[PDB]
């Protein structure tokens, strides 16, 4: 489907993601993750989730992978001039999707 935000538009079906019109290319992960979030604009969510549905039940990789991943997904938005939404740090408890 389709979710849109201002310039930013997130295309489920490709996996794309455009500024303006622009391409902003992202690695699966990032856009799933980023999609995931989206989804539920303005709810916090645990890491512990994110990571459970984002990167699988089973995942074992031992790192801040989805803190590393809001990190690039953040700079991939910033870089093309989006900051009227944002992903929030809520420390402690999670990660928010919202307006600026």
């Not at 500024?19 to 856009?31: A, D, L």
């Not at 809520?90 to 307006?99: A, D, H, I, S, T």
């Amino acid at each position: 489907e389709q979710l849109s935000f201002d310039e930013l538009t997130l295309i489920n079906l490709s996996k794309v993601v455009t500024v303006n019109g622009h391409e902003v290319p992202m690695r699966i992960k990032e856009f799933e993750l980023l999609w995931y979030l989206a989804s539920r604009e303005n709810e916090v969510i645990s890491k512990s989730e994110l990571l459970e549905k984002v990167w699988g039940y089973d995942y074992y990789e031992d790192a801040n992978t989805v803190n590393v991943h809001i990190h690039r997904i953040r700079e991939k938005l910033e870089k093309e001039s989006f900051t009227t939404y944002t992903i929030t740090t809520v420390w402690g408890l999670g990660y928010k999707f919202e307006r600026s």
